[PDB]
Design a binder for this molecule. Structure first.
Ligand code: CA
Ligand code: CA
Lengths: 97, 305, 307, 90
């Protein structure tokens, strides 16, 4: 069986309805490199669970799942990751002499 | 140990000047990044000048125990640097050399010394006896053991700590001393104690936190700059989840983390209102902090919770 | 695991040849050092040809052996992995720092392990798995009580049997352990992989503490390196006497090796002499030889591992 | 005052010490000049191994004294290294 996952460049993987959700995120890693724990996969309005299998989610051939990268916690008032990185870089600024 | 008169401060100034002149050698090609000995020594001179002007009695300032210990170490450390150049000769200009490695080590020590002096003399006035230790449990220990003292000999500190957090051997005590004795003078100041207990909080598991982060964790890199963190992780730029964590000589008591993202970028961050080991546990579970220094195996710090 | 016949072996042989031709691309600049896939795959072929020679006329007997079925299944998968790795990797296969090239390096180690296992279980082309001598007596008694004469068991069965004698505290710890002991990466544990693991992380009485202290939480541990790589790694610490690392050898599975910087600017390599590695590390620190793991100023104190 | 330490290579190194310096302090000075880790150092003077906790005036070591700086069936270290190297022969 085959299916598609969408950077916007839809990819194609070969799987059977018996393979688990953890294995799907593994096959993504062989093509996109993203670690599986950062991968979040949506199928028709919900985020699938790394346990329940493909047949356990009624996934059919030619279907599509959206891939959304998990993000570091963005608590209220936190710095964005770029702001945090720029702040730490400025710890090393110097005015010599 | 001995009292500090003006003549002794002037001797130290002259020794610092000679270190500065030695480190101005173009053949050294000193990196323009912290710790920068060519700024740290003039800044140390300047803060000492500031202290002296607050005490225009100099009898009082010269008898202060912390200041006596600090000035003795300053004289010892600058003389050590001067001997390093004379012994090292042309090897000082080879980066892989033991002389050059030692100069790097001494440059950090001068950085720690200035941070400590500014911590104890924040506006040039002695304030060690009112120094506020950051972590409550750590402060209660220091007050019960040492009261209002600003500095204690290592043997006194070790014995007091062992009553609360047993130190199992002479070997473990020497490793601990190497981490906490930042200014390498065989004393523990309240400032050094504050830094250590901030880094290795919570107090309830202090030595276990220290062992698990600074001794047995391949992600630990000790002191690095931001630029150096990027350089270290560059090897693993295409291995998302590779990470290291490190100390900043410009921000003592602060942990910082660097990691490789899924899209080939290196980002740097700090633990958010939580001990470093909890950030490491969380980052592993969330897929960000997987491969310490690129290694496939990651220490599991869960037992510290 | 499905029954093996001559057709399956011939299939695996053609897949191995394509991996060989892929690895012969001059744009790879494959280093002539172990693990060397251009020798391993021809050596695996020649050993399989030898096993078949031994079982000519009893081919039905060879094809139902559980170890052999699992092995050929894994051999086929790993070669297909490698072919697909080249396909997905394209021009990035020729940048060493790339994920694809790093994955090729990982698969070359796996092929080395698989050949060593296969020669361990079929020493002269004859099946000897059910008489495999496990080196450490305590480990041998564990395997016999739990698995009898079995040559290979599913990972879940091994994890369950191990947990009864050495508890595994979490699924996190379990997956870290599997990664170390499942050398052939086939979700089984052979008696051969078990022998290697228990030789490295002896004594049996503190097995998992030994493993954690050496393979997980020790910055001097370097996993698999060659002799030349040990020297190159320590070269930056050539003027820091007492800098040391320790590592595994893919040509001598189950053996530890140590490298250290002497006082006079030389790098020497040695093995623990008739003692577990952690004792050699404890002794080496006390004697002033093994002070700075990978050049670092702090050194794990393994003294707690002694009984 | 200065004392001298003869190494195993026949090298005489010159240290500046005090009579009150411990043997541990001396080994630290030797490391400063030679790079030898103190735990690898054994010191011998007038027929005795010198103990780390004791001082120079304890052993009656005077100005310009000279100290000396210093498994069956086993391989030598060179034989061991050559053997491990040969593991990687192709
Ligand atoms: Ca101190
Ligand atoms: Ca296996």
């Amino acid at each position: 069986m085959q299916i598609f996952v969408k950077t916007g460049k839809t990819i194609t993987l070969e799987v059977e309805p018996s393979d688990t959700i953890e294995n799907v995120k593994a096959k993504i890693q062989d093509k996109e490199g993203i670690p599986p724990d950062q991968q979040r996969l949506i199928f028709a309005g919900k985020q699938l669970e790394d346990g329940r299998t493909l047949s356990d989610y009624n996934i059919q051939k030619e279907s599509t799942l959206h891939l959304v990268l998990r993000l570091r916690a963005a608590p209220g008032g936190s710095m964005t990751v770029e702001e945090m990185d720029s702040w730490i870089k400025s710890w090393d600024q110097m005015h010599h002499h | 140990p001995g009292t500090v008169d003006k003549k002794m401060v002037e001797k130290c100034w002259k020794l610092m000047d000679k270190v500065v002149r030695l480190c101005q050698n173009p053949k050294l090609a000193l990196k323009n990044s912290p710790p920068y000995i060519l700024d740290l020594l003039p800044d140390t001179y300047q803060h000492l000048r500031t202290i002296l002007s607050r005490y225009e009695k100099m009898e009082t300032l010269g008898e202060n125990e912390y200041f006596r210990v600090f000035m003795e170490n300053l004289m010892k450390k600058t003389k050590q640097t001067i001997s390093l150049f004379k012994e090292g000769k042309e090897r000082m200009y080879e980066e892989n050399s033991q002389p050059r490695r030692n100069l790097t080590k001494l440059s950090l020590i001068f950085s720690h010394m200035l941070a400590e002096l500014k911590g104890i003399f924040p506006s040039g006035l002695f304030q060690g006896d009112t120094f506020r230790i950051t972590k409550a449990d750590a402060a209660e220990f220091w007050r019960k053991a040492f009261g209002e003292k600003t500095i204690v000999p290592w043997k006194s500190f070790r014995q007091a700590l062992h009553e609360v957090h047993p130190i199992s051997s002479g070997l473990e005590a020497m490793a601990l001393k190497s981490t906490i004795d930042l200014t390498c003078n065989d004393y523990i100041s309240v400032f050094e104690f504050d830094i250590f207990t901030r880094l290795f909080q919570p107090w309830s598991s202090l030595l276990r936190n220290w062992n698990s982060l600074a001794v047995t964790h391949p992600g630990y890199m000790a002191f690095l700059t931001y630029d150096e963190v990027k350089a270290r992780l560059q090897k693993f730029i295409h291995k998302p989840g590779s990470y290291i964590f490190r100390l900043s000589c410009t921000r003592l008591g602060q942990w910082a983390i660097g990691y490789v993202t899924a899209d080939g970028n290196i980002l740097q961050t700090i633990p958010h209102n939580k001990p470093l080991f909890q950030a490491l546990i969380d980052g592993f579970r969330e897929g960000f902090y997987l491969f310490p220094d690129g290694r496939n195996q990651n220490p599991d710090l869960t037992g510290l919770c």
